[PDB]
Amino acid sequence: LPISMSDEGDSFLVKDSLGENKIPKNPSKVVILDLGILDTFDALKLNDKVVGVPAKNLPKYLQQFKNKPSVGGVQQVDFEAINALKPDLIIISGRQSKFYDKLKEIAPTLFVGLDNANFLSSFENNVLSVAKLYGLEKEALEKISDIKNEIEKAKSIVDEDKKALIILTNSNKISAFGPQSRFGIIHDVLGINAVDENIKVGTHGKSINSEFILEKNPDYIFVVDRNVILGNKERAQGILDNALVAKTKAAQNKKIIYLDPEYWYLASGNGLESLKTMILEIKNAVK
Numbered sequence: 001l002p003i004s005m006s007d008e009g010d011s012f013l014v015k016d017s018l019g020e021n022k023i024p025k026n027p028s029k030v031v032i033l034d035l036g037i038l039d040t041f042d043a044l045k046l047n048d049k050v051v052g053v054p055a056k057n058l059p060k061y062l063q064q065f066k067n068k069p070s071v072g073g074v075q076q077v078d079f080e081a082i083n084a085l086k087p088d089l090i091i092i093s094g095r096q097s098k099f100y101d102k103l104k105e106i107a108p109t110l111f112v113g114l115d116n117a118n119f120l121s122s123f124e125n126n127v128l129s130v131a132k133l134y135g136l137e138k139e140a141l142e143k144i145s146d147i148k149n150e151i152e153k154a155k156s157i158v159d160e161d162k163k164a165l166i167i168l169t170n171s172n173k174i175s176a177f178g179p180q181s182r183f184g185i186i187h188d189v190l191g192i193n194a195v196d197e198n199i200k201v202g203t204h205g206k207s208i209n210s211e212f213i214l215e216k217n218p219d220y221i222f223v224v225d226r227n228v229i230l231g232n233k234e235r236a237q238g239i240l241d242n243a244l245v246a247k248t249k250a251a252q253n254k255k256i257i258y259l260d261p262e263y264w265y266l267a268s269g270n271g272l273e274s275l276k277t278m279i280l281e282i283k284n285a286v287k
């Protein structure tokens with residue numbers, strides 16, 4: 001399940017949860033489909049190694065890669081474009097696991113998935129494995145260290161009594177997420193208590209309504225509005241403007257927090273800088 005690597009010696013033999021690859025050291029033509037690992041290449045000064053990115057889903061904080069060749073979107077993967085580039089490495093996360101075999105035909109394909117049950121250790125493993133390919137472990141370890149310090153700063157101001165609910169909105173549907181989920185970092189790493197520790201659910205969450213939100217009466221509601229990533233004009237603010245949500249402590253104290261979906265939904269948690277931004281976003285909403 002974690003990435004492991006043996007040096008031998010112009011290359012690494014690399015094993016991860018999807019399979020095995022010989023990856024050359026210092027690859028010079030890397031197609032990156034995980035946006036977080038893309039941010040990490042920037043933080044490690046490896047921008048020139050990147051030859052393909054998913055320009056259809058390129059967020060505001062990664063616009064320094066806007067000039068790179070497109071390999072489509074995180075879901076709409078453009079295989080002909082990837083093949084045309086003749087990359088020496090393709091890096092993917094969970095969203096492209098269904099395309100593994102076709103990708104691995106083109107070139108070695110490294111899986112940098114984030115484990116929702118073990119976010120930090122998978123994050124470190126992902127970043128260090130990538131850094132190892134380039135002999136950059138020292139630099140990566142220093143930046144991981146900074147992230148851990150940001151985590152400690154954020155934890156330090158968390159109000160132990162208060163509780164949060166995490167929701168996703170899509171069209172007019174609300175779904176809920178708790179510990180060990182795709183947004184679990186809020187509870188599992190930053191220490192914010194859940195209104196319901198037992199939601200323990202999947203990729204697009206547990207169906208709920210406003211009645212459920214009032215019943216839980218969260219002090220904080222963290223909202224990931226998926227409509228923004230695609231078709232509005234529906235917006236979480238609209239969905240949540242009703243008398244049930246309005247009675248809630250979160251609504252009353254203006255602690256309905258609209259998290260930037262270009263980080264939370266697109267899931268750039270592998271990024272040495274984007275993960276920091278996400279941590280500060282949570283810290284600043286609760287401090």
Ligand SMILES: O=C(N[C@@H](CO)C(=O)O)c1cccc(O)c1O
Pocket residue numbers: 074075095204229
């Ligand atoms: O198309 C997507 N998901 C399908 C399942 O909800 C859908 O039909 O919208 C989709 C698009 C961009 C990003 C995603 O994570 C995603 O799941």
Ligand SMILES: O=C(N[C@@H](CO)C(=O)O)c1cccc(O)c1O
Pocket residue numbers: 075094095203265
């Ligand atoms: O593969 C995913 N979802 C599929 C729904 O079955 C999809 O491709 O839409 C998927 C995986 C991680 C994160 C996602 O947002 C996501 O949509």
Ligand SMILES: [Fe+3]
Pocket residue numbers: none
């Ligand atoms: Fe999705």
